[PDB]
Amino acid sequence: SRKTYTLTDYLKNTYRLKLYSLRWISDHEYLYKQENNILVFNAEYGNSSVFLENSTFDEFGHSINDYSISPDGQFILLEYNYVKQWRHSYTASYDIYDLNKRQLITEERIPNNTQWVTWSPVGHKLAYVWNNDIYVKIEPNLPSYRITWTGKEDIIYNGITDWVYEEEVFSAYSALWWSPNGTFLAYAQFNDTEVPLIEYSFYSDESLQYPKTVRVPYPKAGAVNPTVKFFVVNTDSLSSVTNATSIQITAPASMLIGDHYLCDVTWATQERISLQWLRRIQNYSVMDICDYDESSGRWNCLVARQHIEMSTTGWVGRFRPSEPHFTLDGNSFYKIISNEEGYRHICYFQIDKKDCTFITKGTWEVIGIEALTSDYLYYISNEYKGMPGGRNLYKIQLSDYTKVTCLSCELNPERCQYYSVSFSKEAKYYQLRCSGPGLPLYTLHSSVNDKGLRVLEDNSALDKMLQNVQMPSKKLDFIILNETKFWYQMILPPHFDKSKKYPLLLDVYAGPCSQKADTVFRLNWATYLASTENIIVASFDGRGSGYQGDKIMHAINRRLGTFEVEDQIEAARQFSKMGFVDNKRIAIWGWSYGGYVTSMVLGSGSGVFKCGIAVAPVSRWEYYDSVYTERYMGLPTPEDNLDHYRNSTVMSRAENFKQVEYLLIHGTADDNVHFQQSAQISKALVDVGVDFQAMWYTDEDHGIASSTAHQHIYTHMSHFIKQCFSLP
Amino acid sequence: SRKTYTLTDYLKNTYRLKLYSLRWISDHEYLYKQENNILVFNAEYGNSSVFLENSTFDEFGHSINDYSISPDGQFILLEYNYVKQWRHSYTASYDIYDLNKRQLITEERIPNNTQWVTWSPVGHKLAYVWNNDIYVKIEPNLPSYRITWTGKEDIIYNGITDWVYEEEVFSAYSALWWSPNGTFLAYAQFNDTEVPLIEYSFYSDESLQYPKTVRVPYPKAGAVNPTVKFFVVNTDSLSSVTNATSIQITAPASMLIGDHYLCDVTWATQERISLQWLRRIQNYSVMDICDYDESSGRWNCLVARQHIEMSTTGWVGRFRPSEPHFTLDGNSFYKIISNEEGYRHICYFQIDKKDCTFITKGTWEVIGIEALTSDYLYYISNEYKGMPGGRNLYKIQLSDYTKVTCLSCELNPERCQYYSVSFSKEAKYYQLRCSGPGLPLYTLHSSVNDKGLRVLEDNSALDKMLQNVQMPSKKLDFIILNETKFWYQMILPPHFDKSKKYPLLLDVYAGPCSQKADTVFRLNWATYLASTENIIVASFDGRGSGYQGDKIMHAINRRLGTFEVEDQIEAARQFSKMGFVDNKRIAIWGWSYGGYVTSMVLGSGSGVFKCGIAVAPVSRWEYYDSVYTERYMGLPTPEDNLDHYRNSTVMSRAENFKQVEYLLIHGTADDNVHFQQSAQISKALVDVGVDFQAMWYTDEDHGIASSTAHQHIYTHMSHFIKQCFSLP
Numbered sequence A, B: 001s002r003k004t005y006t007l008t009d010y011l012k013n014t015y016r017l018k019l020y021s022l023r024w025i026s027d028h029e030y031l032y033k034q035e036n037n038i039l040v041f042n043a044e045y046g047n048s049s050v051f052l053e054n055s056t057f058d059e060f061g062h063s064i065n066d067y068s069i070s071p072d073g074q075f076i077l078l079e080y081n082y083v084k085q086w087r088h089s090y091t092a093s094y095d096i097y098d099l100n101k102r103q104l105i106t107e108e109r110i111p112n113n114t115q116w117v118t119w120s121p122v123g124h125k126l127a128y129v130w131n132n133d134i135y136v137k138i139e140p141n142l143p144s145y146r147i148t149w150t151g152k153e154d155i156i157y158n159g160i161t162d163w164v165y166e167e168e169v170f171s172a173y174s175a176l177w178w179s180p181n182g183t184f185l186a187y188a189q190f191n192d193t194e195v196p197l198i199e200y201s202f203y204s205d206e207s208l209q210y211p212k213t214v215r216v217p218y219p220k221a222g223a224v225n226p227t228v229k230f231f232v233v234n235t236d237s238l239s240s241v242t243n244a245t246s247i248q249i250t251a252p253a254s255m256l257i258g259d260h261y262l263c264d265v266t267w268a269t270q271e272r273i274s275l276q277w278l279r280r281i282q283n284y285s286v287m288d289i290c291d292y293d294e295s296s297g298r299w300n301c302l303v304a305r306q307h308i309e310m311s312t313t314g315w316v317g318r319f320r321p322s323e324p325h326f327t328l329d330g331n332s333f334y335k336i337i338s339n340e341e342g343y344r345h346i347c348y349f350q351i352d353k354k355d356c357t358f359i360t361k362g363t364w365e366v367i368g369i370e371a372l373t374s375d376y377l378y379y380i381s382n383e384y385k386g387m388p389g390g391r392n393l394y395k396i397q398l399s400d401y402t403k404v405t406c407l408s409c410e411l412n413p414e415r416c417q418y419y420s421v422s423f424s425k426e427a428k429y430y431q432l433r434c435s436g437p438g439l440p441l442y443t444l445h446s447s448v449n450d451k452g453l454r455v456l457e458d459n460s461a462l463d464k465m466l467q468n469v470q471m472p473s474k475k476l477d478f479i480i481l482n483e484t485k486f487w488y489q490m491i492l493p494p495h496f497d498k499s500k501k502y503p504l505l506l507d508v509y510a511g512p513c514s515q516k517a518d519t520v521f522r523l524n525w526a527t528y529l530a531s532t533e534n535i536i537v538a539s540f541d542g543r544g545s546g547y548q549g550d551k552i553m554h555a556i557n558r559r560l561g562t563f564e565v566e567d568q569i570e571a572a573r574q575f576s577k578m579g580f581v582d583n584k585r586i587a588i589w590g591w592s593y594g595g596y597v598t599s600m601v602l603g604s605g606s607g608v609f610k611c612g613i614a615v616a617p618v619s620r621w622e623y624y625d626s627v628y629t630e631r632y633m634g635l636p637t638p639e640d641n642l643d644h645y646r647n648s649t650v651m652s653r654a655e656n657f658k659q660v661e662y663l664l665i666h667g668t669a670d671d672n673v674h675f676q677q678s679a680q681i682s683k684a685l686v687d688v689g690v691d692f693q694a695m696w697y698t699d700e701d702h703g704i705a706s707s708t709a710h711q712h713i714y715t716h717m718s719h720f721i722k723q724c725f726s727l728p
């Protein structure tokens, strides 16, 4: 009976989680920002010298957005004038500071408006992208060599991804890859010549008299995609009297007979590079393994060494083919592939032998491979307790596959069931991040004996303040439909009394391979809704969700907008059954795919929901980008899946919105889910004569993430939900 | 105590006003459509033959949008495939039907996509515009002659106006003018080369995968305007072996020294044409009077016959310089100009004498000159009863200026105080349209003796149905501020009991020279609000309004967004004083300028209003079009009026919205008041953390006038108002 977690608490960020972001630099040391002084810590003993002080750049003259230290400690890269583009891309200006000579490098600098910069993985070589071309600097103070000359704004991209490659395939702006010791620089080249443009108004400061039209090469579903090429250049034989020789590695022939994507590049040795390609119909992929050829000076990709990967029940990978991890000599590698029972497990490959050996099996999936030593492989899985929403670090003995030790399950089972890990340069040490269900807990460990060295952060600061407030609780459980379990989670109000009728808000994402029912600790809008408004905020992972094998995941293949929406409605019904839910007060809300599902649900006239909110929803699949959409729906042609594209829009369900209160919200400068989508919904609802609520956000994009917009939307949503539930 | 006027009554249009739209064809006959048979009526005796039957075109094969009969009765022009553009512009396809030969003209037809068509004023010559060029047809079946070759989409306009000329100067798409007997075709040419474009998304049917970007030459305030040229061509000497000759008529030299507009063209004789020009700073204008010069084949405007008109207190004209009406010999003309007491009266000019003589004076304005015979001039004025919102037909004896007869005041003073008139080809007859405060009443009259011939329509059909419903009443009165009267109107609920506290909705337009307090009979949203919801819907004409002379009209010169908004707030206060108003329930709403004022008012934090709705508001003047904006504000430069442009935005008042409930509504395809404006408001409110309501209308323009959008918005607004007033 103290204060509750209020809307303002969330919005103003009064209760803050501490983190412990460290960047390893050797096998023995790491860096950490402390009161703006980057410090170097000794993994073993824990002592720390100051590496650089908040002082050093008092009079830089510019506000410093980020730093990045050369792998050999000698120089430090300074990032300023940060201007965001899409989710990962941005441009900045850069300056290099010599640490020996305590000075800034004044001549032959990095241009203003640089799109990407990266060090070589050892030493202090530099590669950067400027007006879509790649440049290399051997020494920070020396003149840079030009690698490509073809770069052209919104047409040719060298070393950086276009829109759809950034967002849907690499999850990165960067499209260049150094070889381990820095000899080679590989890069992708993207030709967007015939990719159609999305165009939308941007309004800017009210001083701007005419609105700007932003235009972006963006392939909607079934439209014309970019084409890609791959090159490797030798930075050691750069001339300054000759243009650099870039060596192309063509796609596999099987890929060349139609549209495809380059979807993974991973160096294997100093002279071996592995590449993964994927057909536009994303159920067939091929891996190439290429060796440097001394006498030719090109890259030989032995077809004997190819490895085909495909799926009959859906698409390849969770979102794309998994990345390989090679052994030091690079003759074999481990990779997560789905077994024949449909479960994602670690497989073991020989460069030239065509099959592989699973080194794990079970009714659970490997989340990712984390580290590879000479006789141990470390990975994260959801095996422990057989709960998919959990997350734990395991290690397996390379010389004996039965010897599997769980490195985190036992460490604190009550507080910690969701871990991630960050290893040191050779895995002498590792840092565990526990993120639920208790308050996050960062610790350090040495791999040699798996000894827990010390506690890095434990959020006891926050723990104090939090017993001062009536927090909500989280139940993670499952229900059974057709004797398979489907997990749900519920944020329950403080003093939850199971005999009363609570109003319930269904929190939905439901996208392919999504997981909204997990054991993470979160301070968010739902916390406020439970704590202050006594609303149960529930999420449910139905068909289509991940981490439970392909029978659940691929269940929506080619059939988006069906099973995942019906299972959501079902879950609602089940919650009524549970008894502590007010029947006549169930709501639903979600963002992106979440908004689509919300809308599809509200549109189905199942009468289960009183109302919902869709934020930046997809409304019909022909509008979303090709790489994502087609991965699940294939092509919107009559020979393929046009029928289901058309059978699955929100607008056809417009009529049924007559039975629900609806809130449509969408940022006008949304480059991802275009405003178009919401605009099509409103139109549909107007036409069939349905009242609803609406909200645009001028110049906000898909994040609606700008400070004041963020507060404004949640505020507007809160009022909506309260009035919908008749709370005061 | 029967049924009331409901929201559905308004939206579904259950109670319909009958009209009597007649198109005169001679001095003795007129046409009238009647369950789809155009009939010719005999003005004198009232009998009627059928002129053409709904039958004639049963199997035309196309749906017929409109007709237009050649002045000489021989042919009939048929308009189909109507596709709307802006307020007046559209394109259509056309067919000419021979009435003698009872046939359609099959060869040498009018192209699909014709932008404007018009007959010569006598005979059956044709002029049309296609891809921005002018063509003339001497006979309907003959090949057309090409007049201009320079026409170019969105750049060069021959014979039609660009955006801003259509909307703000000619109130017409058409920019060509026949001489009285059809000898000459005058036309304007518009060069939009450097006029910047407004661009906005259009979404179309949901089948359209990528949104279309509409782009339109549109000069915002202070931006680069179009330039204009004026030509006359002789249609009688057209060749078919020679490109046809267009004599240009340059603007006044005094105009060529800076930006200007052509703002009126009016033929005076068979060989005399009058032109009015206006400087971009719209307080100085010049009239040219041009004669055909047989000897040069050219047009001569003696500088000695020019007539300079200007204003020191504001701009010239109500919205532009008034049109001249010439005597038959074309040596003198009448024109409405403002006198030195500031009142708009009819002035009498001699082509070459530099002064003019007022033929009316008084504390009232002439609304317009209607007809001119050899010894009588007919006009509409707001003189009767000294009420500006009234409207009556007067006639003045040309031979004696003291002999002024009021032709309509007395006809039915109780039912009729707002008249318009339509004269026959020589003013032998005239049709009065009474439009308030009673139900509209159309009658016919002969001018010879001013005898009322018969009643054409009296809406008794509607009168019947209307006593079956509890209608509201309208009070028209004034209040006094600084011993001048300012008029208000109130739509009062049925059984209005002056001792109760009613909730009040302030209906605002407030634009320069506007009039929202008049005696017209209207069936609209306000009727519903009064009748069914017992809300007083009030309007108030404050400073800036028209028809009361320049001291009231010009009061907001260079100072938009001040006096007109403060007077609106004042009026609200006055209504509280009246005693029958609920203090804590005053609302305000308006559209366009009306939305601007509403917003400015809500933003002033006068605490008088609980809430308001802005539909397609102007938010800052730099966004609206040049011709309108500058007419009142001048140029947004530091040497001129930049300061007041900046001191008068809605967004700077954002903070004060914290004290009111707000609804922002705007059509996304608004080519007039661009969506941009509302987008800037929302952004401002978000940034300062103010909650509000919003609604966009996908693909609707400034009218929000499409059938389903129209119903949807008024519905959405109604809920808003009801909840704001706590009404069931």
Ligand SMILES: *[C@@H]1O[C@H](CO[C@H]2O[C@@H](C)[C@@H](O)[C@@H](O)[C@@H]2O)[C@@H](O[C@@H]2O[C@H](CO)[C@@H](O)[C@H](O)[C@H]2NC(C)=O)[C@H](O)[C@H]1NC(C)=O
Pocket: A040, A041, A042, A045, A047, A048, A049
């Ligand atoms: C952190 O301190 C260590 C030294 O402190 C530890 O030495 C161990 C041998 C052990 O006995 C332990 O109890 C003790 O606390 C620093 O190691 C140093 O490294 C460099 C040589 O490269 C030198 O500066 C020191 O001479 C050397 N110490 C020893 C005794 O070997 C280490 O530098 C420091 N780390 C930082 C950056 O804070």
Ligand SMILES: *[C@@H]1O[C@H](CO)[C@@H](O[C@@H]2O[C@H](CO)[C@@H](O)[C@H](O)[C@H]2NC(C)=O)[C@H](O)[C@H]1NC(C)=O
Pocket: A093, A109, A110, A111, A112
């Ligand atoms: C990047 O842009 C900046 C800012 O526009 C440039 O800054 C100017 O640099 C020169 C130094 O000789 C001076 O003329 C000015 O004093 C600078 N302006 C400021 C505010 O510092 C800069 O030159 C550009 N840098 C690079 C790497 O080209």
Ligand SMILES: *[C@@H]1O[C@H](CO)[C@@H](O[C@@H]2O[C@H](CO)[C@@H](O)[C@H](O)[C@H]2NC(C)=O)[C@H](O)[C@H]1NC(C)=O
Pocket: A181, A182, A183, A234, A236, A270, A271
């Ligand atoms: C980094 O790896 C590269 C690639 O193997 C090494 O470069 C080779 O060096 C040896 C000489 O010791 C030669 O056999 C090859 O000709 C080199 N490859 C070429 C042509 O690039 C290099 O030794 C490694 N280390 C460095 C130089 O940092």
Ligand SMILES: *[C@@H]1O[C@H](CO)[C@@H](O[C@@H]2O[C@H](CO)[C@@H](O)[C@H](O)[C@H]2NC(C)=O)[C@H](O)[C@H]1NC(C)=O
Pocket: B181, B182, B183, B234, B236, B270, B271
């Ligand atoms: C319309 O008026 C025009 C001129 O106002 C008349 O034609 C001109 O005037 C006289 C009379 O025919 C001639 O001397 C000229 O040759 C004519 N000008 C030209 C070349 O067009 C014409 O008579 C009138 N037509 C009608 C319908 O009455």
Ligand SMILES: *[C@@H]1O[C@H](CO)[C@@H](O[C@@H]2O[C@H](CO)[C@@H](O)[C@H](O)[C@H]2NC(C)=O)[C@H](O)[C@H]1NC(C)=O
Pocket: B279, B281, B283, B284, B634, B639, B640
């Ligand atoms: C049109 O209006 C302008 C602006 O109101 C008038 O010019 C102002 O008046 C006097 C005399 O020119 C000056 O002291 C001001 O500096 C003027 N202001 C500006 C910005 O022009 C002008 O008199 C009017 N008539 C015209 C076009 O001659």
Ligand SMILES: *[C@@H]1O[C@H](CO[C@H]2O[C@@H](C)[C@@H](O)[C@@H](O)[C@@H]2O)[C@@H](O)[C@H](O)[C@H]1NC(C)=O
Pocket: B040, B041, B042, B045, B047, B048, B049
């Ligand atoms: C209408 O009638 C005209 C006939 O003239 C006589 O009409 C009688 C009704 C009567 O009033 C007499 O005074 C008139 O002299 C005829 O000539 C017109 O052409 C007719 N018009 C039409 C369109 O039918």
Ligand SMILES: *[C@@H]1O[C@H](CO)[C@@H](O)[C@H](O)[C@H]1NC(C)=O
Pocket: A149, A241, A242, A243
């Ligand atoms: C390198 O390539 C560019 C473009 O092809 C060319 O203009 C430039 O001259 C070349 N430089 C040398 C050294 O040949």
Ligand SMILES: *[C@@H]1O[C@H](CO)[C@@H](O)[C@H](O)[C@H]1NC(C)=O
Pocket: A281, A283, A284, A310, A311, A312, A634
């Ligand atoms: C990929 O999936 C599509 C759609 O079901 C189908 O046409 C094809 O058989 C699949 N191809 C392969 C190689 O699995």
Ligand SMILES: *[C@@H]1O[C@H](CO)[C@@H](O)[C@H](O)[C@H]1NC(C)=O
Pocket: B034, B035, B036, B037, B054, B055
């Ligand atoms: C054609 O007009 C006459 C009016 O007298 C009417 O009787 C007939 O039914 C009409 N048809 C239409 C379409 O109104």
Ligand SMILES: *[C@@H]1O[C@H](CO)[C@@H](O)[C@H](O)[C@H]1NC(C)=O
Pocket: B093, B109, B110, B111, B112
């Ligand atoms: C105009 O359009 C229709 C449809 O394309 C065509 O059949 C017709 O003949 C066209 N001709 C004209 C009127 O120029």
Ligand SMILES: *[C@@H]1O[C@H](CO)[C@@H](O)[C@H](O)[C@H]1NC(C)=O
Pocket: B149, B241, B242, B243
């Ligand atoms: C008339 O004008 C146009 C454009 O200047 C020219 O191309 C055409 O050849 C001319 N022809 C005639 C018919 O005189």
Ligand SMILES: *[C@H]1O[C@H](CO)[C@@H](O)[C@H](O)[C@H]1NC(C)=O
Pocket: A035, A036, A037, A053, A054, A055
């Ligand atoms: C950053 O500067 C100093 C340098 O050592 C650091 O100790 C301190 O905590 C920070 N300075 C302050 C007091 O803000």
Ligand SMILES: *[C@H]1O[C@H](CO)[C@@H](O)[C@H](O)[C@H]1NC(C)=O
Pocket: A481, A482, A543, A570
């Ligand atoms: C069993 O599967 C789902 C849940 O997985 C269930 O709701 C459905 O009714 C059954 N089968 C189907 C989808 O035909």
Ligand SMILES: *[C@H]1O[C@H](CO)[C@@H](O)[C@H](O)[C@H]1NC(C)=O
Pocket: B481, B482, B570
């Ligand atoms: C009279 O005009 C307005 C009308 O309310 C008022 O604001 C003003 O104070 C009065 N007088 C003067 C001197 O402006």
